[PDB]
Structure 1
Amino acid sequence: GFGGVEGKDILVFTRQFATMIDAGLPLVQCLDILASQMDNPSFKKVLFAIKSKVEQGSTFADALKEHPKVFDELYVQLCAAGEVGGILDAILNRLAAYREKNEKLKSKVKSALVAIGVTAVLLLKVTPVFEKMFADFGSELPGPTQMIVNFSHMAQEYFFHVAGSIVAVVMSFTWSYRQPLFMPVFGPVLRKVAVARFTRTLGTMISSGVPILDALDVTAKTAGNRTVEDAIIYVRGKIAEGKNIAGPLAETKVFPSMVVQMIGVGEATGAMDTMLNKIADFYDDEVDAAAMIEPVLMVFLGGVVGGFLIGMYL
C-alpha cells in the first residue's frame, strides 16, 4: 500500500512540466529540472525515477506508470494521448490547468465520494436533518398540526418547513458550487494567481539554465491572462532592446516595489534563478492563504438553519 501526493504538490509539478516541455526543452531535461527544484523529497525522488525510465527511451506516460498510486489511469491516458497525437505540450497544459482546479477545489470545500463529496453531502444535509428532528419531538409544536388531520392537509400546512429546509439546502449548495465609460478599466487584469504562475515558470526555466530572454519568449506564449501576455510581450521587447529586467518590470503595476527591488539585486548577482524561486514560493503561499470563501459559508450555514427554526416558531 502506497498513497499519492497532495493536491498542491501534483499541481506545482504538473504546472512546471507543462511549462518546461512547452519551452522546447528535452523531456528528460524538463524532468531533471523539476526534480532539482523540488522542496519535498518524495517528489524529487519520484521524478528522478520517472526521468530514469524516459532516458531508457520509454514515453512519459509509460514512465509515470511506475507511480500508478500518484498518476492515475486518467492522467497517464491524457499524457499518452498527447504523445500518440504529437500534442504532449498542449495535454500537459491541460493537465496543469486540471491539477490547479483540483487543488483550488479541494482547499475550498474543506476550508472552515472523496473527502469533498462526503463533507458536501454531510454539510448540505446537517441542518435540514436537525430541523426534521426538532419537528419530530412529539406533536403540537409551533406551526404543526395534530396528527388526526387528513395527511394531505397536514403535509400542505407544513409546506412552510419543507420550504425552509429546501432553501437551506439551496444555500449550502450555492456556497459549495460558487466557492469551489472607460472600457480598458473593465478588462480582467493580472491576479495573484497569474503572478504566482509567471514567477514559478520563470524561476523554473532560469534554475534549469535557460537565459532570461529564452524563458520570457516561452512564457509570453504560455501566459493565460491576455493583459499579462501584453505586459510580458512588452517586458521581453524592452529587455531584448537592452533595458535592464527590473526596469521593464517597474513600468507595470502588477510587480510590487519589493519584487522589482529583489529582481534588481538578482540582475547584479547572477542569482535571478533563485530570487525568482523564493518570490514564487512566497506568492504560491500568499495565494493558498487567500479565507473569505469559508467565513461567508458559515454565515449562510447557521443563518439559514436559524431562519428555518424561527420560521415555524412564529
Structure 2
Amino acid sequence: GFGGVEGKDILVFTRQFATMIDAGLPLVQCLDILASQMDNPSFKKVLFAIKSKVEQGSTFADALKEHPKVFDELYVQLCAAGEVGGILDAILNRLAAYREKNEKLKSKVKSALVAIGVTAVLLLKVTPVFEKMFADFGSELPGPTQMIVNFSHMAQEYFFHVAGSIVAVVMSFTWSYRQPLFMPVFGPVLRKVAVARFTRTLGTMISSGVPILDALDVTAKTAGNRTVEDAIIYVRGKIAEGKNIAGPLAETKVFPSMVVQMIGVGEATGAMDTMLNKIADFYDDEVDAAAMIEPVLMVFLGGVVGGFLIGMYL
C-alpha cells in the first residue's frame, strides 16, 4: 500500500512540466529540472525515477506508470494521448490547468465520494436533518398540526418547513458550487494567481539554465491572462532592446516595489534563478492563504438553519 501526493504538490509539478516541455526543452531535461527544484523529497525522488525510465527511451506516460498510486489511469491516458497525437505540450497544459482546479477545489470545500463529496453531502444535509428532528419531538409544536388531520392537509400546512429546509439546502449548495465609460478599466487584469504562475515558470526555466530572454519568449506564449501576455510581450521587447529586467518590470503595476527591488539585486548577482524561486514560493503561499470563501459559508450555514427554526416558531 502506497498513497499519492497532495493536491498542491501534483499541481506545482504538473504546472512546471507543462511549462518546461512547452519551452522546447528535452523531456528528460524538463524532468531533471523539476526534480532539482523540488522542496519535498518524495517528489524529487519520484521524478528522478520517472526521468530514469524516459532516458531508457520509454514515453512519459509509460514512465509515470511506475507511480500508478500518484498518476492515475486518467492522467497517464491524457499524457499518452498527447504523445500518440504529437500534442504532449498542449495535454500537459491541460493537465496543469486540471491539477490547479483540483487543488483550488479541494482547499475550498474543506476550508472552515472523496473527502469533498462526503463533507458536501454531510454539510448540505446537517441542518435540514436537525430541523426534521426538532419537528419530530412529539406533536403540537409551533406551526404543526395534530396528527388526526387528513395527511394531505397536514403535509400542505407544513409546506412552510419543507420550504425552509429546501432553501437551506439551496444555500449550502450555492456556497459549495460558487466557492469551489472607460472600457480598458473593465478588462480582467493580472491576479495573484497569474503572478504566482509567471514567477514559478520563470524561476523554473532560469534554475534549469535557460537565459532570461529564452524563458520570457516561452512564457509570453504560455501566459493565460491576455493583459499579462501584453505586459510580458512588452517586458521581453524592452529587455531584448537592452533595458535592464527590473526596469521593464517597474513600468507595470502588477510587480510590487519589493519584487522589482529583489529582481534588481538578482540582475547584479547572477542569482535571478533563485530570487525568482523564493518570490514564487512566497506568492504560491500568499495565494493558498487567500479565507473569505469559508467565513461567508458559515454565515449562510447557521443563518439559514436559524431562519428555518424561527420560521415555524412564529
TM-score, normalised via structure 1 length: 1.00
Count of residue correspondences: 314
Deviation string 1:25-71 (CA, Å, 9 cap, x unpaired) is 00000000000000000000000000000000000000000000000
Deviation string 1:249-298 (CA, Å, 9 cap, x unpaired) is 00000000000000000000000000000000000000000000000000
- Segments of 4+ moved more than 4 angstroms: none
Q: Which residue of 1 aligns with 2:78?
A: 78
Provide the rounded CA distance (Å) in 2 between the counterparts of 1:31 and 1:279: 22
Please state how far the C-alpha of 1:180 moved relative to its aligned partner.
0.0
Deviation string 1:110-159 (CA, Å, 9 cap, x unpaired) is 00000000000000000000000000000000000000000000000000
Q: Which residue of 1 aligns with 2:95?
A: 95
Provide the rounded CA distance (Å) in 1 between the counterparts of 2:18 and 2:205: 12
**Aligned: 1:108 with 2:108:** yes
Please state how far the C-alpha of 1:305 moved relative to its aligned partner.
0.0
Q: Classify the secondary structure of the residue corresponding to 2:101.
A: helix
Provide the rounded CA distance (Å) in 2 between the counterparts of 1:127 and 1:183: 45
**Aligned: 1:157 with 2:142:** no
Provide the rounded CA distance (Å) in 2 between the counterparts of 1:184 and 1:165: 44
Deviation string 1:197-253 (CA, Å, 9 cap, x unpaired) is 000000000000000000000000000000000000000000000000000000000
Please state how far the C-alpha of 1:186 moved relative to its aligned partner.
0.0
Q: Classify the secondary structure of the residue corresponding to 2:96.
A: helix
Task: Note the aligned Cα RMSD (angstroms).
Answer: 0.0
**Aligned: 1:12 with 2:27:** no
Q: Classify the secondary structure of the residue corresponding to 2:105.
A: helix
User: Superposition pairs for residues 174-189 of structure 1, below 5 Å?
Assistant: 174-189=174-189
Provide the rounded CA distance (Å) in 2 between the counterparts of 1:182 and 1:123: 43
Q: Classify the secondary structure of the residue corresponding to 1:5.
A: coil
Please state how far the C-alpha of 1:189 moved relative to its aligned partner.
0.0
Please state how far the C-alpha of 1:20 moved relative to its aligned partner.
0.0
Deviation string 1:45-104 (CA, Å, 9 cap, x unpaired) is 000000000000000000000000000000000000000000000000000000000000
TM-score, normalised via structure 2 length: 1.00
Q: Classify the secondary structure of the residue corresponding to 1:69.
A: coil
